[PDB]
Ligand binder design. Structure first.
Ligand SMILES: [Co+2]
Ligand SMILES: [Co+2]
Ligand SMILES: [Co+2]
Ligand SMILES: [Co+2]
Ligand SMILES: [Co+2]
Ligand SMILES: [Co+2]
Ligand SMILES: [Co+2]
Ligand SMILES: [Co+2]
Ligand SMILES: [Co+2]
Ligand SMILES: [Co+2]
Ligand SMILES: [Co+2]
Ligand SMILES: [Co+2]
Ligand SMILES: [Co+2]
Ligand SMILES: [Co+2]
Ligand SMILES: [Co+2]
Ligand SMILES: [Co+2]
Ligand SMILES: [Co+2]
Ligand SMILES: [Co+2]
Ligand SMILES: [Co+2]
Ligand SMILES: [Co+2]
Ligand SMILES: [Co+2]
Ligand SMILES: [Co+2]
Ligand SMILES: [Co+2]
Ligand SMILES: [Co+2]
Ligand SMILES: [Co+2]
Ligand SMILES: [Co+2]
Ligand SMILES: [Co+2]
Ligand SMILES: [Co+2]
Ligand SMILES: [Co+2]
Ligand SMILES: [Co+2]
Ligand SMILES: [Co+2]
Ligand SMILES: [Co+2]
Ligand SMILES: [Co+2]
Ligand SMILES: [Co+2]
Ligand SMILES: [Co+2]
Ligand SMILES: [Co+2]
Ligand SMILES: [Co+2]
Ligand SMILES: [Co+2]
Ligand SMILES: [Co+2]
Ligand SMILES: [Co+2]
Ligand SMILES: [Co+2]
Ligand SMILES: [Co+2]
Ligand SMILES: [Co+2]
Ligand SMILES: [Co+2]
Ligand SMILES: [Co+2]
Ligand SMILES: [Co+2]
Ligand SMILES: [Co+2]
Ligand SMILES: [Co+2]
Ligand SMILES: [Co+2]
Ligand SMILES: [Co+2]
Ligand SMILES: [Co+2]
Ligand SMILES: [Co+2]
Ligand SMILES: [Co+2]
Ligand SMILES: [Co+2]
Ligand SMILES: [Co+2]
Ligand SMILES: [Co+2]
Ligand SMILES: [Co+2]
Ligand SMILES: [Co+2]
Ligand SMILES: [Co+2]
Ligand SMILES: [Co+2]
Ligand SMILES: [Co+2]
Ligand SMILES: [Co+2]
Ligand SMILES: [Co+2]
Ligand SMILES: [Co+2]
Ligand SMILES: [Co+2]
Ligand SMILES: [Co+2]
Ligand SMILES: [Co+2]
Ligand SMILES: [Co+2]
Ligand SMILES: [Co+2]
Ligand SMILES: [Co+2]
Ligand SMILES: [Co+2]
Ligand SMILES: [Co+2]
Ligand SMILES: [Co+2]
Ligand SMILES: [Co+2]
Ligand SMILES: [Co+2]
Ligand SMILES: [Co+2]
Ligand SMILES: [Co+2]
Ligand SMILES: [Co+2]
Ligand SMILES: [Co+2]
Ligand SMILES: [Co+2]
Ligand SMILES: [Co+2]
Ligand SMILES: [Co+2]
Ligand SMILES: [Co+2]
Ligand SMILES: [Co+2]
Ligand SMILES: [Co+2]
Ligand SMILES: [Co+2]
Ligand SMILES: [Co+2]
Ligand SMILES: [Co+2]
Ligand SMILES: [Co+2]
Ligand SMILES: [Co+2]
Lengths: 150, 150, 156, 150, 150, 156, 151, 151, 156, 150, 150, 156
């Protein structure tokens, strides 16, 4: 693994994640609908911007971002599933949180890799993204009645 | 074909199209880079909003939008291809225009279908989207040195 | 008059002036009396709806003026003509009961607007037709979202 | 009459008044149409906000606001009449001014009542509303060519 | 007639109309000067935007808009006359209203024409423009002390 | 010490500087530790309250300066003088429990502000009297809304 | 440079009398055009108050000392004022406003010639800009009165 | 109601003298605190000009007739003015400003008692709000001078 | 007729009312018919110019009113008096050709405004003189920038 | 020490510091009053935001922030004292600068600590806060006529 | 000296002046630090804009602006010196005022020159700049306790 | 001094103060003299870069102040110390040549900032290190975009 391969893997992950955010946005039901429906728009924008920043950082270090759905599905470690039967709001937020934790943990691996390779800019970028992910994990775990690392 | 099936087909198309817009945004080169790079961000936002409006109109008429990359690829008539060898700006804009024309022509079919079924709201929505697509076709054809229907 | 048998764009629009005035007062009733854990979100949401349907009401009344009509403009007339129903708040209602009343009235307006859409189409009043379709688009979106709050599908 | 009863009476009055403002807004004709049509929108907003503040102050002191057209008509002292025959702009503004004077004088009674009962917050709220009403009375009387209190 | 010919006729009409609006803006006198002078600026912007939208819709369906004063005069049904003698504010507003009614009635013909030809986008555009014209006719007739269709 | 025995306006205002500093820290405690389905709404709502009561505190302190007083300005002084109580967050609290603590403190401030309104009216300090009434107006509105969240009437 | 200084100071005095007159009209006007003209006077009050500050601060920048008391304004202004004793019609109030605008126009024209003769390009340019606005106001308020700008 | 009317009109006169004094300070000040206090005077000019318009329009709304000429302001104001003849230090200018703020504070206190006695709740409330701001300014400008607010 | 023979300021300004109305229509012609790789930038740029020269036109007309004149106010009058030329769009023009036509018209207006500056200076109309200088300043900047687009020096 | 303990210590410090900022804001006198009174409002907001960011970072790593005045006093190394006698503006600013230097030096220790523990996000947060403190130290030292590290 | 040579001389002057403004911005100390540090940013922006407008006016009259530090130093009459020993705030403001006076007096020569040559646009531009310089001279002299021209 | 052998954070930062002043003047050179069909877009783009790198320059100088240094503050010193090169504009340059000069200078700054990033890391100046990384991130993005304009890959 080198930095280019890591960033491209995250281009794929973030495209799967933003589509998942839309799935949750569209299908959610329950008393917290109005608040969490809007919250998903905030996350969609934020992680869409993460995705563009990752892709353009990859461009700037001489790489070539994945840029088709086929490539995203071939490379993403984030999982997706069609919405077939009704899920509770908690179940949807557990799927969201689980994907946030996955991104956190993979970003930590990219932070270590970019440090080893001496790519200070990419390292810094990933740290800033992790800071936001860690905050989201605390808040969505709190919604679920749980501690952030529980 | 009924209105629900038509709208869901366009959810799939618009997700393939916005990813294609990003492909063009990222990989373009040439003297018009700064203008068209920004222009692609405008289109990305606009057609992303079309997509959300289509999906939520589908929800509001009792339908269930596709919400995974797998479903989008299974259903889209918009085509995608990985970016492997360098394309000129004109070639990228021809791919863009060709997809705009496809969406125009399929939206016209949805306009006829929703009129036949008496779904006035969906009909009106599609007409408004076609108005913007037709304007884009004129402008991007003009960039290419061509008439809008040439 | 009954919208379902309604024959006349002017009559239909005036009926909706009455309806929308009853509806905005109902939105305030819900805004004021609601209790429960979703209070802060739904209290503000009712302010959004109050503004939106008040604007619908002004647009309907002024479209009626523009086609040569005379809008109802007193509480007496609104009560004499509205098919939207109201009731004084006497005993406690749960948030779900309040939202069910809201959704039921949205469905009534949706269905009456669809009657007006057909009527204006047949009479060739393209502007009024287009106006009502835009209003229905918003109502349909609200019905989906408030049904979702209630744990239900939009047309369930 | 205690403070709760007084405030509820004004909830009723203000709902009759805002409908009257719309009657004037809709039916007015004459050379001052454009200015006064917009001015009525300003008043409609202002007295609608007074109405909500009165109702919510009533809630905060343990009361229950009237919340139906039926209740507003049964309790309002503000008068209304359907628009049957043409009225001049001056006649419409005379009706507006007459109602502003009614509200002014009733708010003065409410100011005295709340001072007697020790409800400092409600007292302060009513004084602020009267301040605006007094200003409107001066300006609309001036429009009519008259002194504010003549 | 076909849709292209109709739209080009309105390009000509709207260019004559915006100049007429400026004529009224510049030469008006009377007590309502300040309000109506500014109101004509509002109309000038609005109908200038209608004109650009009509011309660019014409482009988008493969047409070629008139684009010279000579062509506008050769094709407009809206009439113009030099300001050679004093006119009252009522006379100027009667001229404005008459031209609004002419445009309303021609847009109605274009609405019927585009419906028959199946040009849903152009049909929708013309309806939106008629909606605004109908509102202006009510308001300016009210200024003149008249009912909208009087 | 006790606001019910406040000798004068200066002492009363300084007591509220102390109270409001304890209260804004309690608002942060609730903001940070809350959990439950209403988290996103109430977490933001606590930021609104923190700003508002922080501004009340600065206004009280600067009014005290303007009448020749000297505001408390250390944590030690705030703790020596506040009647608002605080406790470290040890065992978990439900969202409703946190909101009950918030409402209880709002009621305490309401009732002490009422004492200060009566005191300043007696002393003829019209400006301070008016300031306290405006603050009470907001507190009364908050009590209604947070009681509604809890499913209760405002004075229940 | 004393002639330019004296001219600018005379206009500090004029503009302070004028803004008070604008308030007089703003406060006492009655009639059907009240709402439009009441607000219009607020626009004029702001604009001519800003002219006044610009004039005074230009005077400072060329080494002068602006009049800065009501007593001095009255001792020096050529703009006239009168207490409001009996009601005036809206047209009468607008005629007074227009007359004062014409007075300022004509005195500024004198100041434009004076500053050109003295070679004070900055002050000359400032006065031309003010006259441009005054000329526009004269056209618009004359039109309100049913009149041509210079008739 | 004539006592409330007379009080408000007296304050129309005072505030017109005061805003001109604020301009005097704004224009003539010199010293190291120039940039901050020059801008601060613009804030005060706007605020007390708005108080003046609010006072005059409240007077109109209770049936009164505001003074509306420099002559009337001078005949009635208790705020004093003096031509700027010899340079003053920045501290001296701020002492004059503070003294005038204290004058307005104390007269408003009288007006607050008067309107309470006459039962004019609206005017009473307006004056209290103005006094609140004046009291804050007195604290801040006294602090600038190194002094306590009431010392 | 010819600005080089303009008898007075009123006649000159009215000639420019005519010129600017022909010019804004030409700007729209270019805006609508342009094709080529610089389309998106120059299509928007023509909207900027249309607004700016439309404002110049209104300023010229209202200055003419303020000095006792009577602006041309019909297409017929504009065509009878303009020295700016127009032609229908028939055969295709390149973007560079359209920009050459634009620059040529800017140069015409520059040179006529210079005549009006000299005329108003002679007549002592300081306000109109100043207005025309400000307009020339913008035209000179546009000539530099559009000549640069064409690969040329401003006065080449 | 570990990262959680360090961050909680700074929650305590920052709550003592914001109260000290208010002390200076309220009691300052002298010719620089207007500028420095407003400047303390800027600092109050900034360090209040640092405090919330520190507390919420602590939450996001599984910690529990101090949340009472009692705990803040038990744990802060920033010192406070009642305002009992007149201080010059220089004295107040010397107290401010001394506390900024204390915070700078403790943040340096936390930067080293979080680096050693591998908490990249917390490390990055503390560096950004130190950057602002270092700038303030230069500017307030300049106010006092001193070099930044004098 | 013709207009082109004069304008180019001021391009050089203004580049030396903006660097001097930064020197003062960076090195100033004393009780007026916060106010004057920000004031220097205002001046830096203003005279940078003057410089660009001068250069672009020179372009529009067929000239070629100096565009290197070497050229600016060879042509500027504004003087510069490295900051070697401490200067008081008053000394720094005296240097600023002295340079403003230099620019004022040179712009006056340029105003005379452009009037002689008939360059009305350049003449007008220089007068506007002098207007601002004259205002700054009054205000900074006032800061120093002096009359504007003494 | 030579950044590549640079030993001292203060020396490195001051060297970049000099560089950034030469660079912003070069950006103006390009802004003023450019010609060609991309004029309107790249003329504005140079304004963006001028503001951005001027802000970098102020941030570098003030970081140097904050660590006890003394920024160069005269054109003489900037020329004595900059490694960024400048040349008078004498003969015409194509837009591509101007953009090649821009890109070459961006690459020089990138590579010198990387030297400063390593130096500040070794010295333990975390704040200066973080500042330089943020600046490099922007420079790297510009290099990609301007190379794309030139038809080249970012590191080609
Ligand atoms: Co992979
Ligand atoms: Co919620
Ligand atoms: Co919310
Ligand atoms: Co982005
Ligand atoms: Co992007
Ligand atoms: Co892989
Ligand atoms: Co960073
Ligand atoms: Co749960
Ligand atoms: Co399909
Ligand atoms: Co381009
Ligand atoms: Co662009
Ligand atoms: Co959306
Ligand atoms: Co959505
Ligand atoms: Co299918
Ligand atoms: Co539509
Ligand atoms: Co091509
Ligand atoms: Co009916
Ligand atoms: Co019936
Ligand atoms: Co509306
Ligand atoms: Co309306
Ligand atoms: Co149908
Ligand atoms: Co039809
Ligand atoms: Co529509
Ligand atoms: Co439920
Ligand atoms: Co009753
Ligand atoms: Co409200
Ligand atoms: Co409400
Ligand atoms: Co009753
Ligand atoms: Co009448
Ligand atoms: Co109040
Ligand atoms: Co025709
Ligand atoms: Co009239
Ligand atoms: Co009017
Ligand atoms: Co108006
Ligand atoms: Co446009
Ligand atoms: Co257009
Ligand atoms: Co008439
Ligand atoms: Co059809
Ligand atoms: Co439509
Ligand atoms: Co339609
Ligand atoms: Co009439
Ligand atoms: Co106590
Ligand atoms: Co505050
Ligand atoms: Co404060
Ligand atoms: Co509960
Ligand atoms: Co109050
Ligand atoms: Co009160
Ligand atoms: Co004189
Ligand atoms: Co000013
Ligand atoms: Co000033
Ligand atoms: Co004299
Ligand atoms: Co008349
Ligand atoms: Co000028
Ligand atoms: Co008196
Ligand atoms: Co006001
Ligand atoms: Co007023
Ligand atoms: Co007296
Ligand atoms: Co002193
Ligand atoms: Co009040
Ligand atoms: Co001619
Ligand atoms: Co204009
Ligand atoms: Co105009
Ligand atoms: Co070419
Ligand atoms: Co000028
Ligand atoms: Co001039
Ligand atoms: Co510790
Ligand atoms: Co000092
Ligand atoms: Co200061
Ligand atoms: Co300041
Ligand atoms: Co926050
Ligand atoms: Co927080
Ligand atoms: Co000292
Ligand atoms: Co590490
Ligand atoms: Co960072
Ligand atoms: Co780092
Ligand atoms: Co010192
Ligand atoms: Co030279
Ligand atoms: Co500029
Ligand atoms: Co430039
Ligand atoms: Co030379
Ligand atoms: Co000194
Ligand atoms: Co000028
Ligand atoms: Co070096
Ligand atoms: Co060496
Ligand atoms: Co900066
Ligand atoms: Co700086
Ligand atoms: Co390293
Ligand atoms: Co280290
Ligand atoms: Co950073
Ligand atoms: Co190339």
């Amino acid at each position: 693994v080198d930095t280019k391969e890591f960033l491209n893997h995250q281009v794929a992950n973030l495209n799967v994640f933003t589509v998942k955010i839309h799935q949750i946005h569209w299908y959610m039901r329950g008393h917290n609908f109005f608040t969490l429906h809007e919250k998903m728009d905030d996350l969609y924008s934020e992680f869409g911007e993460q995705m563009d920043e990752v892709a353009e950082r990859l461009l700037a270090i001489g790489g070539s971002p994945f840029s088709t759905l086929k490539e995203f599905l071939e490379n993403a470690s984030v999982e997706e599933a069609p919405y077939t039967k009704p899920k509770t709001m908690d179940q949807l937020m557990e799927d969201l949180v689980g994907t946030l934790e996955l991104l956190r943990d993979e970003y930590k691996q990219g932070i270590e890799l970019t440090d080893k390779e001496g790519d200070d800019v990419t390292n810094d970028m990933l740290i800033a993204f992790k800071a936001s992910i860690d905050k989201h994990i605390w808040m969505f775990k709190a919604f679920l009645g749980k501690a952030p690392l529980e």
